[PDB]
Write a protein that binds this ligand. Structure first.
Ligand SMILES: O=c1ccn([C@@H]2O[C@H](COP(=O)(O)OP(=O)(O)O)[C@@H](O)[C@H]2O)c(=O)[nH]1
Ligand SMILES: [Mg+2]
Ligand SMILES: [Mn+2]
Length: 233
């Protein structure tokens, strides 16, 4: 795929140190970023809370209306305060084509926020079983068909919304939704610190996942792992 057809969309209500860390990594690798929400009031829930972020989906829904018909375009959505990018657009798109997915979500060890949904997920052996909405990549048309279904409160949970759609077998089959079970593109660090090591790559520090033997592009220092991102770059 042509990197000119990839857009990275993120949300930031302020230019925090985390957002600037994200943005520097994106610019170093020559990604094109679209940032939603700068200077707006965050309504996604008190940052202490372990659920929320629906405002992100509402803003993404509005932006995706521009791309509803762009069959050529690939969009990666990521959190920005606790994410860094560690490889090139060419590497990312090669791995995306290899996934065979039209919308690939990051995966994690914990079924959150509704533990009772865990039984509805396919069992996948040693891979990461559950959906995490801090990063996903897919065709713009497919993403629009997902986010246009958002009709909830700004402090409702984004992850629960995407989870319930992913868990609908008919929809998952029709739209070709998938999870990145072996952290080939997305590395969620919460629940996987025992799996990762630092690796020098052209005088940059990135992550190798030694459990799956992968070199993820997107590193998400979610939950209490946020400070681990300061070793990368
Ligand atoms: O005041 C805020 C809080 C959050 N965010 C955005 O919402 C994302 C989700 O927040 P967090 O990473 O804490 O969520 P979690 O990874 O725990 O679901 C952040 O990375 C930012 O992109 C924002 O723009 N402003
Ligand atoms: Mg969350
Ligand atoms: Mn996050």
């Amino acid at each position: 795929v042509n990197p000119e057809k990839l857009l990275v969309i993120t949300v930031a209500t302020a230019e925090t140190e985390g957002y600037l860390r994200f943005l520097r990594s994106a610019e170093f690798f020559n990604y094109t970023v679209r940032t939603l929400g700068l200077g707006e009031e965050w309504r996604g829930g008190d940052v202490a809370r372990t659920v929320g972020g629906g405002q992100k989906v509402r803003w993404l829904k509005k932006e995706m209306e521009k791309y509803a018909d762009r069959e050529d375009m690939i969009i990666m959505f990521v959190d920005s305060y606790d994410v860094i990018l560690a490889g090139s657009p060419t590497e990312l798109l090669k791995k995306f084509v290899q996934s065979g997915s039209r919308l690939l979500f990051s995966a994690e060890s914990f079924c959150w926020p509704e533990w009772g949904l865990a039984e509805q997920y396919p069992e996948v052996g040693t891979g990461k079983r559950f959906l995490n909405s801090g990063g996903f990549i897919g065709f713009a048309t497919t993403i629009h068909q997902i986010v246009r279904q958002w009709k909830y409160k700004d402090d409702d949970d984004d992850q629960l919304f995407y989870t319930r759609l992913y868990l609908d077998p008919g929809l998952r089959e029709k739209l070709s939704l998938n999870l990145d079970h072996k952290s080939r593109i997305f590395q969620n660090l919460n629940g996987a610190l025992d799996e990762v090591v630092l690796k020098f790559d052209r005088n940059r520090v990135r992550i190798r996942n030694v459990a799956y033997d992968t070199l993820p592009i997107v590193v998400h220092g979610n939950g209490p792992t946020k400070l681990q991102l300061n070793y990368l770059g």
